[PDB]
Design a protein around this nucleic acid. Structure first.
Length: 496
DNA sequence: TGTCCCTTCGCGTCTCT
DNA sequence: AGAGACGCGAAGGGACA
């Protein structure tokens, strides 16, 4: 590709064509993902070692090879997985998937070598679990984070009062090293000068860019409180959810948004308190006029659309599509606002646009049912999964369309549908649950984990405490999902 | 032009009652 | 049942070789 070379392009494109063949069978999206991030050396490395990565002792799926290859240094990560996967699984007890997750970030090589070197000491001397070490390692710069937990976990616990879990949370994001050092430096001043609790500092620091959010809360908390009238809680929420950039934008736009456009401080805070809050704030300031007059909506509706991650994208997509969705497809504004007012609003809107007619015509759903599916977070995903799975769920597993639609009409609908497909046969035929009981467990937020937690308990039946008969577990699962089930595991281990 | 590390923003899912 | 928590990842920026 790179034009300090030529007809090297034929050689390169021919390498890519061959990956479409066996043992990987990569499709265009997969090659694209590799070329976009691992680059041409990752493309070449995947091709040179396609047999070794896909055979024993590694046995990686194509998708796992793609996940490793598609990051800066992917060639090194691929090399290093081949060397260390077996020892990490066998000697350190990790699964192949955990090794892959570690490997699948920029500088994956470094992270893999560092888990090898440090996992034991982190577990034995600092008391972490292997899962915790995996979570710290599985981000860009995971080497740095691992080494920084090793060096700092003791002072942060003993001098500053944090639990190991808190330290793990601060560490387990990109730039975990920086967030950890910055908490070490600034936790005292933030608690003593600005009146924050330890937990609030942890919350601010426990997201990508935590260092920056922390330094910015230090700098801007006084101004935002004593000049613009926000409370400390509100500053924390902004810092925690929208970071540095949202804090700076709030400082700039609070006056304009409140005085000129008529918003409450609460409303500005709510827009600010999400990933991309800066973008959401700047986009409501631009678009509030056109959205509210020029027919359209109330400020309250614009505020609701803006008040989710990707608010900017949702607002802009609502601007573009509200006319065509109401006029050509027959929806009301209110329905468009519901579809738009979740994370991924943009995506849900766009997917309703091209799928509303396919879902009614090719599968017999009504428009109202399509709106319901689309009006939760991940609407795009749920819609595409109903399109794909409705045939098989009805005709093989014997469910009704209304049942499929119920499962799909919660956040994570895609996950619940796919879990039902996977687990309905074993739940019914082997354990005596009815289809209706599986549907009822599935038709809640957290459907997938609740179905998986109920199968896990039914199949092992673990600690043979059978006073929870099948129907009781079904009711527990319906009422409180996995957490209800895990809690009851927690609560039995010896009071009984 | 590759490798490593850090930050911002967007999407999707689950828990909290 | 929606707020806020959870996790995963694309994409872009700098440092340095």
């Amino acid at each position: 590709m790179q034009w300090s070379g030529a007809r090297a392009l034929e050689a390169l494109l021919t390498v890519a064509g061959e990956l479409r063949g066996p043992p990987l069978q990569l499709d265009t999206g997969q090659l694209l993902k590799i070329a976009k991030r691992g680059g041409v050396t990752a493309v070449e490395a995947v091709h040179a070692w396609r047999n070794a990565l896909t055979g024993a002792p590694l046995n990686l799926t194509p998708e796992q090879v793609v996940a490793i290859a598609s990051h800066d240094g992917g060639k090194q990560a691929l090399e290093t997985v081949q060397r260390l996967l077996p020892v990490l699984c066998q000697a350190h007890g990790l699964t192949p998937q955990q090794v892959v997750a570690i490997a699948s970030h920029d500088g994956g090589k470094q992270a893999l070598e560092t888990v090898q070197r440090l996992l034991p000491v982190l577990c034995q001397a600092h008391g972490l679990t292997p899962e915790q070490v995996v979570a710290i390692a599985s981000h860009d710069g995971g080497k740095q984070a691992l080494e920084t937990v090793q060096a700092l976990l003791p002072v942060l616990c003993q001098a500053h009062g944090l639990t190991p879990e808190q330290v793990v949370a601060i560490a387990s994001n990109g730039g975990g090293k920086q967030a950890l050092e910055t908490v070490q430096r600034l936790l005292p001043v933030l608690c003593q000068a600005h009146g924050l609790t330890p937990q609030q500092v942890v919350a601010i620091a426990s997201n990508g860019g935590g260092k920056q959010a922390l330094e910015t809360v230090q700098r801007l908390l006084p101004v935002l409180c004593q000049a613009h009238g926000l409370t400390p809680q509100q500053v924390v929420a902004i810092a925690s959810r929208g970071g540095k950039q949202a804090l700076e934008t709030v400082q700039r736009l609070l006056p304009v948004l409140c005085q000129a456009h008529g918003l409450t401080p609460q409303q500005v805070v709510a827009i600010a308190s999400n990933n991309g809050g800066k973008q959401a704030l700047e986009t409501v300031q631009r678009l509030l006029p056109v959205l509210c007059q020029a027919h359209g909506l109330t400020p309250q509706q614009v505020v609701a659309i803006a008040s989710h991650d990707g608010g900017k994208q949702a607002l802009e997509t609502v601007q573009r599509l509200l006319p065509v969705l109401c006029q050509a497809h027959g929806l009301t504004p209110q329905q468009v606002v519901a579809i738009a007012s979740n994370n991924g609003g943009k995506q849900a809107l766009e997917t309703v646009q091209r799928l509303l007619p396919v879902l009614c015509q090719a599968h017999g759903l009504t428009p109202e049912q399509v709106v319901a599916i689309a009006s939760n977070g991940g609407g795009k995903q749920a819609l595409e999964t109903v399109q794909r799975l409705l045939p098989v769920l009805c005709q093989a597993h014997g469910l009704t369309p209304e049942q499929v639609v119920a499962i799909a009409s919660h956040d994570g609908g895609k996950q619940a549908l796919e879990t039902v497909q996977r687990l309905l046969p074993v739940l019914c035929q082997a354990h005596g649950l009815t289809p209706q009981q599986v549907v009822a467990i599935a038709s809640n937020g957290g459907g997938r984990p609740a179905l998986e937690s109920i199968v896990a308990q039914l199949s092992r039946p673990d600690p043979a405490l059978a006073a929870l008969t099948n129907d009781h577990l079904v009711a527990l699962a319906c009422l409180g999902g996995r957490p209800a089930l895990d809690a009851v595991k927690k609560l039995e281990h010896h009071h009984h």
